[PDB]
Structure 1
């Protein structure tokens, strides 16, 4: 009966065993580096294994670093909140306004009406729309908004079962992948890009090459190539390739295709005419995008010139918060008195939901762990021990680092992997006498390449929650898309990334 008892309480016993077996490392080394390494190993073990919720393991550093004497609790608490959180609040307000008034339904239905009911073109339409939507919103929020809509659309198309099951698997997987693919494009698209940008700006304040325009101009071609290749791979793997009737215009449509078009048109008509709340939300979203462009792109710094007395004070989070708080003020619904006043188009009770407080805590914990790693001296020791590896040719170092980051991001969340690997790859970066961007950009791009397992990133879990998918087919599709993404990233780094960032030579802003 002991075996049953130890098997049932696996998580608690594993937590205790992990805490105890690694305890000799700080018990006998008498160094701050050993204690920080113990904290890092415990946190990474609980993130990869998922013995505890990710937010609890994120709160562990604020519990472990002060007691080890590495850094005061005030400093850790300050590190638990950063600029990324303000931008997250603004974007979450925008996404709540979009979801609440069914703007995404209108966009998706107009998209489906424009594209058609041809399954290959239809899946391409969902991938493009989800990528464009995730270009500004977070990948998790974008997937959560788009998955129910596309699921209902494909169910309606099928109704008007092996083929339908394959089609719904394909649409689920393409939504899950396209969310991340679109998130790659911009700094604000996903949390991983934000973490990388914050870390790069803090560690190298001198460097200023990472702007929104530069990030878009070196990420959009690669992301577009990966999107097209992933669409082709998915439609070949699941639906099968029938180009003869695909590219040729089917003017004489079959009865079932025209029935599907008619039922989609009926659904759109049932959705109703565009309302004023949706117009206000769309206008505010467009203003957000235009002002994110408007900060210094290198052509005309329209927004940054007005504030050319205090540079760096106002950032993308400032405009994000501006529009998000505007969403808290514009009247939407008036009101036999019926409470007199209006409704602010977003109530704080609605923003309390739709808001990833767990993700905020997780990112704060990762930032606190990274800061403790820098302060305790662990990063310097890792760089010193990894210095002899610098004699090896650089391109293989980038290849290996990207491969390890990709492999370890299937089991750990993207913020977890990026927060674990930035303080390891950076000291390696200036230990070799190589440009830090040359190693960091491929790693932060490949961190998002998490497609094998539903627990890899939240979008995959959200998509898998519908039950149409199976783990093995998801593994096949993830392997294909991951190979495509890694190949495209390597091709970009070799060919067109280096002309603009001058990655071949060592930069001035990097330490000597």
Structure 2
């Protein structure tokens, strides 16, 4: 009886009780910083627990700040929907344009054909393709895009009789091979998300917070430098993740193991089967002018990203120096140009060309607005802006100095152990909740702590920001895990056991590279720079 009352209605209890229990913080102290801290506590507990939808919880600052004395109504609304947020939204729209007309399927099938026909080769190809795609698209999107192909090839393999998808007899228990494939795709999505700023929202969150807090920083996380910093590590631990999965489920180094014998059965007489499946499933047709135009636009956008301001030559944004252009011009330019351009060029037959039939009506463009309106997560605006506004209000009210002075006791530790504990805390926290929420909670605290100690802020912000995306153990940790558990009836225990490999691999790889090669990318991570000294003296 009374036991399950907590099982069903605990969310309402949290919503009703937490704001009342946190009042003494506000009532017993007089400053505005304590009002801001009350707000931060309530928002953090709502985010971690998910008693309210995240997008709705992010709206609270709009009501809270003007009621208190923090900021006016107009400033708070302007803090939402910044420049970087518009870049992110435009990136989503361009990725939708790519998904429309089916370019991703073309690329994936072509690469899989390039790589071999053995089951291990097929697995390697799937992981590499998913990582490369997830560099530019939302992780859940990429998982949904890749799952059907592997499902089809497994279905055919079972049909011919090479292998069994499910154990013989409550949903059926998946076998080892299907676990290997699906978990590989799910993990590869998350791993590849970390390579690019537009790869996932967490990177945008922590880059934006860092750039808002310290506007005078000599070091910069712009699009090319961030990619230089992140790509090698991504490659290393993606490769290492693939080796672990093969040893865990396919007996890579044990010949006597039964799993190895199953791989040998797949090698003999099944490569031709799945090769036939891929060749037939590549019946898309010849490459059309529609896809060619989309590809050229995408390449042009990326090239514009790298040419905004390199040191080797001037490039644009220095020829056009009346204002700042800042990477929103190319993205929206491409989005508009998608609507302007046609898709056929069949109408030129009127203008003294023989050709064939003339069109019967207006020619469609490369994309339609209805597609965009229905396949964009519009709540990300509120989520990201709420994070930014909370950070800004925390800076202005004066909570930052309070927390920084509070936590100055950690100076006795050496740098390496502090880095390790920060990474561990980030991973442990993100195991249970959304990545964006954890980034929002922990990044400003790290900035203030870094100021209080004599440590370069980037040294701690960047590795932790990357680590917030590493979630493999539980279905609630990240959306791709939930999707994959849904598709193949994966029990939580197997996922939790299998997630041990990627966790340790990523922790070690980040710990080593951030000390060794990040110095090559940023030569001043070890010393406390001058601008940080000025900021700390001011605060």
Q: Mark yes or no: TM-score above 0.5.
A: yes
What CA deviation, in whole Å up to 9, does each residue of 1:6-38 have, x standing for no partner? Answer: 543222122112222222222332222222222
Equivalent position to 2:278, from 257, 264, 267 = 264
Aligned match of 1:480 = 501
- Change in Cα spacing, 1:309 to 1:366, as seen in structure 2 (3 Å) is same
Q: State the 1:234 CA deviation.
A: 1.7
Kindly report which structure 2 residues correspond to 1:102-501, keeping only aligned pairs within 5 A, or say none: 102-160=102-160, 161=164, 162=166, 165-209=175-219, 210-241=221-252, 254-269=268-283, 271-310=284-323, 313-332=324-343, 340-501=361-522
Whether the 8 Å contact between 1:92 and 1:354 is mirrored in structure 2 is: no
- Please state whether the residue corresponding to 2:473 is helix, strand or coil: coil
Larger radius of gyration: 2
Contact 1:332 1:345 in 2 (8 A): yes
Unaligned 5+ segments in structure 1 are: none
More off after superposition, 197-206 vs 90-99: 197-206
* In structure 1, C-alpha distance between the alignment counterparts of 2:484 and 2:51, rounded to whole Å: 23
Contact 2:135-2:193 at 8 Å conserved across structures: yes
Structure 2 residue 525 is matched with structure 1 residue 503: yes
1:495 to partner: Cα distance: 1.6
Output the CA distance in 2 between the equivalents of 1:102 and 1:330.
18
| Contact 2:119–2:267 under 8 Å retained in 1 | no
Residue 187 of structure 1 deviates from its aligned partner by: 2.2
Deviation at 1:299, TM superposition (A): 3.0
User: Is the contact between residue 246 and residue 252 of structure 2 (CA under 8 Å) also seen in structure 1?
Assistant: yes
Q: Comparing 23-32 with 236-245, which one deviates more in the overlay?
A: 236-245
Distance 1:435 1:168 in 2: 45
Q: How far is 1:487 from its partner?
A: 0.7
- Pairwise CA distance, 1:53: 1.0
The answer on whether the counterparts of 1:204 and 1:509 sit within 8 Å (CA) in structure 2 is: no
Contact 2:153 2:274 in 1 (8 A): no
- Structure 1 residue 167 displacement after superposition: 2.6
CA contact (8 A) 1:43 1:57 kept: yes
Report the Cα distance in structure 2 between the residues aligned to 1:208 and 1:480, rounded to whole angstroms: 37
- Give the CA deviation at 1:329: 2.4
Alpha carbons of 1:427 and 1:101: their partners in 2 closer, same or farther (altered >3 Å)? same
CA distance in 2, matches of 1:452, 1:253: 31
Q: CA deviation at 1:301?
A: 4.2
Preserved CA contact (<8 Å) 2:119 2:271: no
Q: Does the CA-based 8 Å contact 1:127-1:175 persist in structure 2?
A: yes
Distance 2:306 2:441 in 1: 30
Residue 16 of structure 1 corresponds to which residue in structure 2? 16
User: What secondary structure is seen at the aligned counterpart in 2 of 1:503?
Assistant: coil
CA-based RMSD: 2.7
Q: Deviations over 1:152-172 (max 9, x none)?
A: 444444445248743332222
Q: How far did 1:146 drift?
A: 2.8
Verify the 8 A CA contact 2:209 2:444 in the aligned structure 1. Answer: no
Question: In the superposition, relative to structure 1, how do residues 242 and 443 fare at CA in structure 2: closer, same or farther (>3 Å)?
Answer: same
1:383 and 1:431 in contact (8 A); partners too: yes
2:74 equivalent in structure 1: 74
Q: Could you tell me how far 1:373 is from its partner in structure 2?
A: 1.4
Looking at structure 2, the residues matched to 223 and 165 of structure 1 have their Cα atoms a distance apart, in angstroms, of 29
Deviation at 1:468, TM superposition (A): 3.5
SS in structure 2 opposite 1:295? Answer: coil
Q: Which moved more, 1:397-406 or 1:26-35?
A: 26-35
CA drift of 1:427 comes to: 0.8
Once the two structures are superposed, the pairs formed by residues 34-49 of structure 1 within 5 Å of their partners are 34-49=34-49
Give the number of aligned pairs.
504
461 and 77 in structure 1: CA distance in 2 versus 1, 3 angstrom threshold = farther
Query: Contact conserved, 1:417 with 1:447, CA < 8 A, in 2?
Result: yes
Structure 2 counterparts to residues 82-93 of structure 1, below 5 A = 82-93=82-93
User: How does the TM-score come out when normalised to structure 2?
Assistant: 0.87
